[PDB]
Amino acid sequence: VHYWKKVLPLLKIIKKKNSIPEPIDPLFKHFHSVDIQASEIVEYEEDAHITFAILDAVNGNIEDAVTAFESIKSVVSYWNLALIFHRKAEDIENDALSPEEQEECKNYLRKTRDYLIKIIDDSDSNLSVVKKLPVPLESVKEMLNSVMQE
């Protein structure tokens, strides 16, 4: 997130096709071979917004993390959405507690199952998506087996 927060100001200037202030004796040689282009800007802004959401989730701002994750239909956002929906279910799933709450708890586990299935459905169909998986495919399937046996 830190490095992202430092780039986005640059990307915005690059987004309007302006010039970046070149460095003074840089430590890591600059190259125009990999200079960022407008074609890729919106992607980074998106990929960054994921990284923001992930940290928000890890810190506790689940409401804002989910709100962000759901906004973009990405394979990685599924694994995050699924991973955090599963945790809200598992903890509340077996202790004595309000029955109405228990139904809401199960409902989250139902969402987990769905998102993992969307991952595998889109994964098996296309190879490019297999490479975007934030974790290995077999790991995603591993959770699903346990998710449904729950």
């Binding site: 903890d91 004595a96 507690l97 309000s98 029955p99």
Partner: protein, 146 residues
């Protein structure tokens, strides 16, 4: 007690997200749990004072008279009728306000009619109530209020 209230007001959240206001749509099982504690802590002391002027445990339920103040009873009857959806469209606004009046006390807000001993009793009674819970959600809530 927390299990009693779950048996009465089903799917009433333990703690309401919108704790900022005292509107009685934000009533929570904690508020009720905090309420009954005072009702009993208050009732016990009142009866203790009575017999001192004149066993209190020994009275059976029908024989004994009202053990709570009509104020407290009015509140419970109101929030009950409201939650269970057996209020009256006309009286909705009145019932709603009757509940609202006491919320600020159950949450120790502006001008709470709370003796320090009753607050402490609420605090520890919730800590130990929460410290024995298994889940984190419930632990956090009860510890927070405490």
């Amino acid at each position: 007690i927390r299990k009693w209230l779950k048996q009465l007001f089903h799917h009433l959240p333990h703690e309401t997200s919108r704790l900022e206001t005292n509107a009685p749509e934000s009533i929570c099982i904690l508020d009720l749990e905090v309420f009954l504690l005072g009702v009993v802590y208050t009732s016990h002391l009142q009866l203790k004072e009575k017999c001192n002027s004149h066993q209190p445990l020994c009275l059976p339920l029908p024989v004994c008279k009202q053990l709570c103040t009509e104020r407290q009873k009015s509140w419970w009857d109101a929030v009950c009728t409201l939650i269970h959806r057996k209020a009256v469209p006309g009286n909705v606004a009145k019932l709603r306000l009757l509940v609202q009046h006491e919320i600020n006390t159950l949450r120790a807000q502006e001008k709470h009619g709370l003796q320090p001993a009753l607050l402490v009793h609420w605090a520890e009674c919730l800590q130990k109530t929460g410290s024995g819970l298994n889940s984190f959600y419930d632990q956090r809530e009860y510890m927070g209020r405490s």
